[PDB]
Every structure is written in C-alpha cells, then in structure tokens.
Scaffold this active site. Sequence first.
Site, PDB file in Angstrom:
ATOM      1  N   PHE A 116       0.795  -1.220   0.000  1.00 25.47           N
ATOM      2  CA  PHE A 116       0.000   0.000   0.000  1.00 25.47           C
ATOM      3  C   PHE A 116       0.829   1.274   0.000  1.00 25.47           C
ATOM      4  CE2 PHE A 116       0.818  -0.725   4.467  1.00 25.47           C
ATOM      5  CZ  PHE A 116       1.014   0.541   4.977  1.00 25.47           C
ATOM      6  N   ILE A 170       3.060   7.453  12.416  1.00 24.64           N
ATOM      7  CA  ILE A 170       2.291   6.535  13.247  1.00 24.64           C
ATOM      8  C   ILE A 170       3.166   6.008  14.379  1.00 24.64           C
ATOM      9  CG2 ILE A 170       0.657   5.904  11.441  1.00 24.64           C
ATOM     10  CD1 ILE A 170       2.350   3.376  10.977  1.00 24.64           C
ATOM     11  N   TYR A 192      -3.410   3.352  13.112  1.00 25.87           N
ATOM     12  CA  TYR A 192      -4.686   3.714  12.502  1.00 25.87           C
ATOM     13  C   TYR A 192      -5.896   3.160  13.250  1.00 25.87           C
ATOM     14  CZ  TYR A 192      -2.373   5.784   8.465  1.00 25.87           C
ATOM     15  OH  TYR A 192      -1.625   6.596   7.645  1.00 25.87           O
ATOM     16  N   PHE A 251       6.201  -3.283   7.702  1.00 23.29           N
ATOM     17  CA  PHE A 251       7.045  -2.283   7.065  1.00 23.29           C
ATOM     18  C   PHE A 251       8.451  -2.831   6.878  1.00 23.29           C
ATOM     19  CE2 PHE A 251       3.774   0.434   8.991  1.00 23.29           C
ATOM     20  CZ  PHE A 251       3.432   1.209   7.901  1.00 23.29           C
TER      21      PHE A 251
END
Lengths: 592, 263, 434, 107, 186
Positions: free
Chosen positions: D36, D56, D82, D99
């Site tokens: 994404f 984040i 999120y 990640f």
Amino acid sequence: LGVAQVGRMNFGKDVSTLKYFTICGLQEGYEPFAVNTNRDITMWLSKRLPQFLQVPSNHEHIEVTRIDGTIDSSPCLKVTQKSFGSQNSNTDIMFYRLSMPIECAEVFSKRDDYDFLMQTSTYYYSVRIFPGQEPANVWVGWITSDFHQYDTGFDLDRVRTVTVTLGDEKGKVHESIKRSNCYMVCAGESMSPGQGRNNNGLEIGCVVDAASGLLTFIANGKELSTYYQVEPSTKLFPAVFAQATSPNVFQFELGRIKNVMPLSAGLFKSEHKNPVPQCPPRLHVQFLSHVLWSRMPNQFLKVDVSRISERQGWLVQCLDPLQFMSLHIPEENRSVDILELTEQEELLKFHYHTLRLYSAVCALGNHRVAHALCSHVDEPQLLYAIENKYMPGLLRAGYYDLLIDIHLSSYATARLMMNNEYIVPMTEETKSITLFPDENKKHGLPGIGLSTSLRPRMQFSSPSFVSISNECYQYSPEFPLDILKSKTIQMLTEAVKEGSLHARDPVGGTTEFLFVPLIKLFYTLLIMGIFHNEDLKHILQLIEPSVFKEAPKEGLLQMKLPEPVKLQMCLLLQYLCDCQVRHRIEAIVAFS
Amino acid sequence: KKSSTLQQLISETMVRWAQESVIEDPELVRAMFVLLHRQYDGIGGLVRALPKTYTINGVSVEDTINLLASLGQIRSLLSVRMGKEEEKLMIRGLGDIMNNKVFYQHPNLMRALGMHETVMEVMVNVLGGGESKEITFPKMVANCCRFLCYFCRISRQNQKAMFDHLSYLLENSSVGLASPAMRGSTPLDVAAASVMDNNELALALREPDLEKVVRYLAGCGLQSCQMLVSKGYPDIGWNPVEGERYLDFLRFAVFCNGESVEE
Amino acid sequence: LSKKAKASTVDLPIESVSLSLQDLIGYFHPPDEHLEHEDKQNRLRALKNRQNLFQEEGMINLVLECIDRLHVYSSAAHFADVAGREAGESWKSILNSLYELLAALIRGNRKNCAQFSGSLDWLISRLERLEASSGILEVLHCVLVESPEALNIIKEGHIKSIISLLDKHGRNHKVLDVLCSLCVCHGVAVRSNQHLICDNLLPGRDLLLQTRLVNHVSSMRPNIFLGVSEGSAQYKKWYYELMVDHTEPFVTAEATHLRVGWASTEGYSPYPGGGEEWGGNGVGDDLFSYGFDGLHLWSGCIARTVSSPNQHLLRTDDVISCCLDLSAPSISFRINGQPVQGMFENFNIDGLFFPVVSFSAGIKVRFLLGGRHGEFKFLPPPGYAPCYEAVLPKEKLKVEHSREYKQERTYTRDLLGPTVSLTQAAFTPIPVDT
Amino acid sequence: GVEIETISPGDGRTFPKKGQTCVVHYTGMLQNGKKFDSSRDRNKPFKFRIGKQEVIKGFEEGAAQMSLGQRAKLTCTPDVAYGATGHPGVIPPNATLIFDVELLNLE
Amino acid sequence: QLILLFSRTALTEKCKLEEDFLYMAYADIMAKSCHDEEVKSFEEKEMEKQKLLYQQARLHDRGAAEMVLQTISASKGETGPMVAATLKLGIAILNGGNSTVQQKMLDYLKEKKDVGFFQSLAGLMQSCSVLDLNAFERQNKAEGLGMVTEEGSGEKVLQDDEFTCDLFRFLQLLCEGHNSDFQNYL
C-alpha cells in the site's frame, strides 16, 4: 510440434533472413507476415499447466445445474454428465472446485444459540454423492490455489505435501508444520455402513474452522477420523473430485448443520452475519482444464553462464533489470501478466471500466481521493504502462488518462481558468519585452521567450500513508515532472518516426491508441507549462520541422492523421496561438 | 510559398484538412473553423484580451497572487456540488478576498476578473438546488450576499455592473426574508444595494421590475408566513416579517440622496 | 390472485399484456444511428413528445404498480403456484419487459427522470434480486445520467447496496458505470458520492482487479538429474554449495530476488514440474521446490522465518551449502558454515530432483558442485556426496536454464515440443523371470 | 507494541535520539501481503522527526529501536497503527501493517 | 461542410437557440462577402450585378438559402444577437431580388411544412421595440442632472434599429420582383 521435436518460425521481420522467399514467393506477390511491423510478433503457445475455469454452457460432457433452496431445502449445485451411456464419452477423473475460497484467520487463537452463531468462524458445505455413483471414485474436501495436478489416476497418497520443521539451536523441534494443496477425503473409505447407500446418497459434510485451521469431516452424521491442520491465512477452495459412473454424479448442497455458520457467510463479506444459506451468482462450479493459451514474454532476462575455473566453478550473472505488470484476481488467488489481456476480452473491459472509475472518483480536484489512488496505482505502474509498446489499446488509454487525472488535472484546469486573463506586473524585466526579438521583423518561436504575466502557483503534496498529518489533502500528489518531460518527448519522437511509415503494429493496435493518448499528455504538459526553452524547441520541430525551423521529414501536421488525432492537433494549435496573444499583451504594456 | 508563420501555417492546414475529406465529427469541424477564424481575425483577439488586461506595481505582486489563488479556489467550486466541505472553503475564500488590500485598491481588476458573476452563479446554483424546499446551507447565501453588498459599495462602477443582474436578484427575492439576523445577508438586500444612493441606477429601474416587488408584497399581505406558522406562531391573515422587507427595497428606489425620484 | 380468488374465476391477461409490452417498447424505440440527421432529429422529436405525453397521465406510476405487484412472488414457480402454469411460464419475461419499458419511457428525458427521484429508494431496494438486477441497473443508469436531481437522494445506504451487488453478482462493468455516473454529472462532481465509493470499495482490495509491478525471476540448474527409487543404482544423500559474488539489494523499486535450494520434477520427466515457465516465481513458490533466502524457508509460496547465527538476507560473500537426503526425506542448509535451524521432511519423492537457484536481476553467484566443477569451501557433512558425482558418464556437467526458452532473437528461437521422460535416469536392473 | 526483525545488520552503535530527523526508506504492506505504500516507488527518502507525533506510533517506535544503516521488518499492530477507524480508502479497519524499513541517515 | 454543420446545429432539437461565437462570426463573413460595397455606365452597372449574382451563388448553391430559414425557425420568436446575424445573411443573399434564392427558400418551406418559421416570424415582429416616452424622459432627466452619459447613445428608445429594419427588409426581399407565389404564401 510433437514429442521431442524442434522447430523454428521466421515471420519475416527481416526479409534477408528468409531464404526461400525469393526462390518462391517474392515474384508471386506474397508478402512476409512481419514485413511492415516495428515490433516482434508475440508468441502464444499452449499452456502446459492446467488451470481452473468455469464449466462452459456447451461442454460436451459436464453440465452444471443450479438448484434454488426451498423452505425445507438449501441452495444446491448439481454436477451431471451429458454424454453418459453414448459412444465417444470420456471416462476419466474430473477435478471440480468452487469459484470462491475461505480465508483462515491471520493469527490463530491459542435451536442454535444466536450468540455462538454470531461469534463463531466455523463454516460448512455438504456433498451428496448420488445413489448409484461409485463412492470409491469420488473425493470430497478442500484444495488451495496451488492445485494444478491433472493426473488420470488420483489417490490420496500421491498428493503434493511437505513438512516444514523449525527447531531451536540445540535441534529440539518446537514446531512441525505440514503443508499441502489437497485436503480431501475419499467417499468410499469414509463410507462406514457398507454397500447399501440407496437409502440416501452419501452425505459428506465438510467443516472448516477459520479461527483454528482444523478441517473436520462428517459422513452420514458421524465424524470421521481424518483431520487436517492448515496454516494461518490459507485460502481453501471447496472442491470435489469424481470419476463419473452415473448420469448424475454429485451435488454441492450449501446448507448448514447444528452450531455451524453457512458457507456463503464465509465466502461473502456482506453476508458475514447471515445464518441463512445462500448461493449468489458469483459462486459457480469450476473444473480443471487444459484449454488455455500462454503468452511468451517479448523479452527475457539476460543471464550469463560460464565456467570461470575448476577452482571457481560455474558463474551465473544477471545484471540488467526487467519488469512486468501483474494483474491479480482476488477471488481466484492467481496473478496474470497484464499483457495477457489482449486475448481476455472480459477482464480487459472490466479493468478498463475500473480505470474509468479511478479517474472518476478523483475528478475535478478531489485531492483526498487522488492521494488514495497512489496506493492502488503506483508511480512505477504509471510509467511502465505509458511506455510499454505491447499494452492493450483500451488499457493504454485508461492508465494514461489516470495519470493526467491523479497528478495533472488540478494545475492544468486552474491554469486554463486564468488563461484568458492577463495581469502583468510593472517590473524591470517586463519593460524589456518587445514584439519582435530583433530588428529583422520575424516572428519568434511561439512559447519561447520571457513572459512576466502573473500565473497560478504550482504546488504538490508528497504521498505518504505513514504520516498522520492532514495538511497534504490539498494540492495534487507529487509526480516526477522532469523524467516525464524527456519520456514524453522520446515517445512522441518515436511515434512520429514510426507511424509515418504506416506500420501494421501501432502501439495499442490502432493509430487512435498510439496518438490520441500521447498528444493528450503532451498537451497537458504544454498547458501546465512544464516544458522550457530547448524542450519546446525540440517538440515544435515534431509538429512542423519547416515553419518552426530555428536558424522528406514531415511532422504531425503532415501524417494523414485520423479524426480523433486531428481534434487534439486543433487544441495543441489553439494553445500555441494563445501563447502569441499573451506575448502581444506583454509587449504592449512594456511600450505603454 | 514558405509560411514562416504560425498564422499562415494554420490558415492552410485547416483548409487542406477539410478539402481532403468530409469530416464526420461535428466537434472536429467546429474546432477546425474556430481556429481559422482566429488566424483571419488577428485583431479580434486584441479586442477581446486587452479588456481583460490589468497592470499592477511590483509592491502588490505577492498580494495579487494571494488574491488570485483565493479567486481560483472559489471558481473551482463551480464544478462541484455544494456541501459541508464547500461551506468552509467558500467562506474562507470570501473572507480572504475581503481581507485583502488589492480588493479595495483595484476595483476594476475585481470587475475584469468576473468575481461578482462567479459569486452570483455560485449563489445561483445554491438557490436553484434547494430554494423551494427552504434554503439549505443558509450560511452560504448569507456570505454570498454580504460580499456582494461590499462589492457594490467599493465603487459606483461596481454598483453599475451589479445592477445589470437585478432581474434575477428580484426573481429570487423570497430566499431568507423571514429568517431573522439575515438582514444585509439576503438576495433582496443585494438588489437594494445596486440602487442605493445612485441616482442614475435609480432612474434606470423599469416598471416591470417594480411590478414584481409589489406582487410579492401583495401576497405577503394576503397569505401568512407558512414557515412561521409551522414554527408555532399564531396564524394571522398576512405576513408582517416578509412584508416589511419588500418596503425598504422600495424605499431605496423612490428616494435617492435625500430627494424623491418623481419618476 | 393475492386475495386467493380461484385462477379460473379471475381473468389474468398474459398474452395480451405480453403483446402490449412488446408493442410499447418498439413504440418507445430510440432512433437508429444509421439514419439521416434530419430523420433522426424528427424521430427524436416524436419520441420526446411521446415520453412527455405518456408521463402526464400517471402512466409511469402504473408500470411501477405492475412491477410491485409482480414482485410479490419470489420466483416463476411461486407465481405459477398461485396462477396458471402458462401464466407463470412468462413471469420473468413480463418482469424483464416492464423494466425495458420503464427504462425507455424516461431515457433521454430529464423531466421524466426528475419525477422519478421519489421512486429510486423503492427501485434500489430490489436490486439484489436476480430476476430484476439488470433491469433495475439499466433504469438506475438512465436516471442518473440524465437527472442531476436524482444524485441528491443517493446516500451511503444506497451506494453500499450498489457496491454489494458487485460482491454478490460478480465482475459487471454496468455496475461501474452506475458508480461512474454517481460521481460526475454534466461536468459537476458530487464530492460526497466521490468520498463514499472510494472509502467503501478501494480499501478492501478484494473485488477490483489489482495491479503490481513484479520483477522477472529466472532459475538456473545444473545438468544433474538425481532421484530416488527402489532397487536402483543411485546414492540417496547429496551435497552442493553456492557462494555469492555480488548482490544489489534494490536494483529497482522492488527487493532483489535470490533463492537457493532444491527442486523436483513431475514424474520422471526432465521438466521442472508444478511451476510457471516465466514470471516472478522462484525456488519455493510451489510444492515442487524448496528454497532458502537467508531468512526464510520457501515451499509452496509460504515463507517461514528460520533462526541462524547472525541471521540476515543473503549478501555479498555469503556461502550457502545445501544438503539433500532422499533415504529419509530431508533438505538442510548451512549458511557460512553455521547450520540453520530449519529443515524440510516428508515431501514427495517420486521424481528427479536437481540443484536450483532463482533470482531477479542484479546478482553474481557461483555453483560449487565439487571436484573439477568448483571446490567446496566447507567440508561436506559425513556421508553426503558432492553433486558432481551424479554426472552420467558421457554427458558433461553444465549449469543451464531451468525452462526451455531463453532471451534471443525470434526467428532463431528453437520451439521445443514435448520432451521424452527421463525414465533412464534411474537405473533399476529388471531382467526376465526364469 | 511492535516487534522488530533485522533483515540486514547496521552499525549497532548509532541510534535515533530526541530531536533528530530520521531518514528512512521504507515499503509498506498489509498482513495479507498487498503493498500500500513505498518510498522507493516515489524515489524519495522519508524524513521525519522523533517525538513530534507526525508519523504513526508503530513506525516511530520501530525507527527508535532501529540503528543506522540497518534494514529490518516492522510489524505494527492496529493499536499503534490507525486503530479501528483505519485510513480511508487505503488501510482497512483493524489491519496489521508490515514495514520494510532501512535507516539511511540521521541528521 | 461549414454550412451543413450550421444547418445541422439548427435542426438539432433544443429548448433555446444557444449563442454560438462561430455562428455569429461566420454569419458576418458570409454576408459581408456578398456585397463588397459618380454615375456608373451601363457596363459598370451590369458588371456590379453579375458579380453580385456570382457572390450570392457562392453560398445558396451550398445550402445557405435553407440555413437562414432553419436558424430563424429554431429561434422560436426570441430576439438576440443570433437572429440579427441570420437576418443579415438572408438579406445579403437576397439583395437584388434573387429569383433563384427566392425559389429555393419557398421550395424548402413547402417541402418541410415548417410551421416553426412562420410562428417565429410572428414572434420576432411582436417583440420588436418602438419609441418609448418614459425611457426618453428618464434619459433626458439624466442628462439634465449633469451626470456623464457613460452609455453610448441612449439605445433604450428604439432598442433595436437594425434588427427591426432587417426583419422587414428580409420580408420585402422575399417578395421583391412581384413574387406572386410567395406573396400568397406569406
């Protein structure tokens, strides 16, 4: 080509390579198949690996009938054989699955009650082996997307399997994981009562727990000893294998049992909490077939293999990068090269209308949706499609207008909104603007020069989904506007060079799929004013080498263009005249 | 024989394209003859662009750029449907425009940019899409009428330009005339600001224009205010709140600069 | 029929109604595109006048009444139970005709599409029905293309119903066009309808076809074809070694692929089984191959993290030694001489194995097969044989492409047909019984 | 919280500290394996400041635990990423984020 | 092609005849090219008439005599810049009482049975402006009060002079030469 046979096809890209054309074929008027092509003709060869596809409505053996669920029944899918009992019938095991899988939980945990039913992740489907079909030739259970094994004799012992054992440093086995693509049972061995089934055909229920991976089986109301423990995130396709010894072979009853959630609730997210069995039209019976083609790549990796020495060994050297765009079917867990859609006419159209929705959800300056489309269509995806010469024509015009809408639709419209308005500051460089560049009253190249009229600011935001700031949803997402200039100039020079010869392979398949796109990002870039000085001087020579000469080749204005290509040369020439009126307003204020 | 000029090259490409074949696209023919007209009328572009030309000092370049971005943020709202997120954008654009020194120093630039028409057509769309079903988004018409009344007060020429749109402003002159605190923020209050203390603009009023304000007041004297009686207020046979607001517009029409217009 | 009057007693027009619903559709027929311009415009003028005159009589709320009173029965059999069999025989046909008439009485007429705004909430509430989905979708598209006042009633519950139709009915392009007309109408973009389709369709990545840029992966294997079978002449345990000369971690936007291990064939064929001839699939992307990448064990396209001293992705000057035991099915690895804490067992042994490396662009690796084909950096584990000792005596050991086709100029490309199975690769001496 | 697995080792002595921008070059993926986000796709190293709450929480903690020149895999739970609202149009609600992060430089 | 495009846009059914810059631009080139305007000799006067006929024949041979009847029938009785430009091209092609154009204009009307043309002519003449005392007095007071006459010439009394004159010159040209077949059709 048969067994152990080698052949070579010379289409005739280079007529020198043809060594019998002149002997017989040149004088007779015949032409090489690739006489005028600018690209290598693609090879489409029969696929070696069988795949799963929907049962055709005209299949000579298989016949799938959909039965709707009554009050006392459940939705059903009957698999029958059309040509049983007649000659030319095929007597071999046929591999059937269902079109949609069930995905297990990402992390495994360590009257029916309407709380347990609402909280459970255990799903169900049942298969009724029809009374008269041999249960010794019918296998029921689950398969994964990796199942591509078409063998005339199928047994549960030769299925592909592997055990991944990970241990600690000392070697103690702390975990052992069995892996396979066929989690199925045999009806004959599962059949406990013996022989007489003509009471009712064997009901083999398949129970899957999408929260623990335990795959259990219940035959005729009794749980069987066989069980499987699949890995997290495993996608299991309801599948039945059967050799047809009956007019009606088996069925796909999609009902439910006590304390177990129906199959449609796990298949479909909308029906996740519906305890009522359903068979929506998206769920259809598929079968393993060999009637499919494969697209040989137009280019392969450069690999160098050679002995270096006895002391070194064999060297393998790959150094130049090669890439392709892969199209993923979510419901089938398979990936297909996007250049294979030149022969898949339904996926091509669906993906084109999907690209037309991508360009519609971010239309007329929707910046919050424009940054959300940079996660689905990336920058490298928006540069491979623009340059690839084997892209389908409809997708080439869909991936092309999507860049111009995600990145270059907000500054190309606002700049046109202040295009018929001239606010020129009274500065020291404004006063140096003259109508003609020098004493010789000759027009300069339209666009090249010093323009001082006030212009809208060009500002973009950098896409990022790890940042939590909300100040990037104004301004369009950032795109490299320096690579794009050179790429567009190179592609347009190549298009002018090639299309002027009237080749049989225009990019996209038609002249309107090679030029109508290209001239529309060239036009958008020119409107935005990204081109400066030399690039405009080099792109004007491609419009007209003679008129715009700075001091047999003919530009776009002389190439016999189609009407849709001629409408964008009237918009390109419309802005090239607005570039002169604006100079004729900047040169009056300076004298003023 | 050698064109050497964009005008000569285009004056020939169009004709050659049309005399080689019959174009089957009505939009290609139309764009093929607009461009030939531009070449054969090179003086017809300087008569259309020069009126849209304005010059500023170097001191005001940044402030004019800041005004132009705000004007663009309002002009781009004419191609989207009016909503909650276009609420704040429109108000902020209007606030930044009116909190700008250029908007007062240069009122002819503001008129050449077509800002008043953009604001009206925004308000035109807002009123058309949801006027008969009571004024949805009423903090839009209020700002679009507060800005358009300062626009008239900036200069007499701005008032004259706004006066040319009186017919529509009187067509939709029952928008928010009964909601209190919306005084001076009403489309009828913009119609009363286009003739306010302007003797020429009051001597330019037509009898048919004055027929309709009287007809509205007549209905306001025979029918009660349905929005106010649905709010619970007692049902008299006439509308006092809306009837008083058709009497002050007429006050700005028959009286100017302390002297009654006898016509 | 609803109040249960006898079918014979009540008169139910079925043939006359079907004939009228077929005459009306042709009466309200759009002009053909091959006609002259004047004739086309004249027929458009007549069609518009018919549509306008055919709406002022409340004739649009009557087709709607017929549709509503025909949707009180779930299916053709349910209708034919209450009515006659012939009446139920043409239930789907009459329903399909009532929408083709409804989508023609309003097509192109903005004022007719503006009076249908009050009946779109009722219309969408029957979109999930299979007997009516296409007709309801066509009427919805006709209304939304024409009337700007019909997009103002569409809410989240109506957009999520159209989106859920794609999920439960498949990949239909005519649902994307209804969703496209929901965003922009006559050059005006509805931001609320643009902020809902995205947030309700895109994040899932489960319905729309997804695209990715994937590197090309090639596989090299030696000439060795080694397998196990009963009563054959082959050594059951083997050893080869791979050490890397160079590896760029990122030659492109995607991570460089480099996997080493063992692969197997399908049957006794010399062809690498259960895999694609090209693409982005490597050693361990199927159940016919087992690979090591320095951090994971790859088999069946599932990766499992494996522990190792100073574990890392394969870099420059890293030695990988692979061990294969076909007596007890086992594949083990050792990185830089240290054993890795992972090993495969109980995989299928019915074919011919071979060493294999898979990679993307930007590597330099060298096979250490033993003997004259590369000298081992680490001593083979006790018992395991070097892989150069499996060469069939007359053939020459050579590292080659795993698949048939390579990079070359097209007219010289050797098109290969099916290849004969290497059943002579396992020497099982079977004489005559005497 | 998040747990970090090193793909390639770093120096092991230089760590991000208060008030220092982190130059990271990352690739974002969902738990199912679908990409994404990727700074490598945009060809831009990602710059952010430690302790400013601009990235984040999972990414921040991972970068804090990271070392200079190191490549590691970051697994972010939905709590630190999120939440249950998700990122509209990109991240589905209640999603775990993986990640692939490389710490290029620290200024 | 230009005339056919302009005669197709006119035949396209629309609620209102929409302003078209191309049409008011090419209705003043086509009309102005057909006149190109002490006592001339007989040969001079007969050469100014044969050139007139050829300049008029350059257009009505391409369908320009039915276009000025289609643009009026699509106006539906509304005065504007678009009927004041169509009424100057009909006059340009009918100057001198051109019998060929008169026959072409009557044949089209008798063939199409166009009722819109005669309903638009009645609406364009009922919308023509006349002298206004109120406007003249309101302007006279304006000049008397000393305020600058920013507007050009007070074209509020007799708002349209040229449109009204051309709308009757066209009707006179359509019957000029004692055209007894169109006099009885009007």
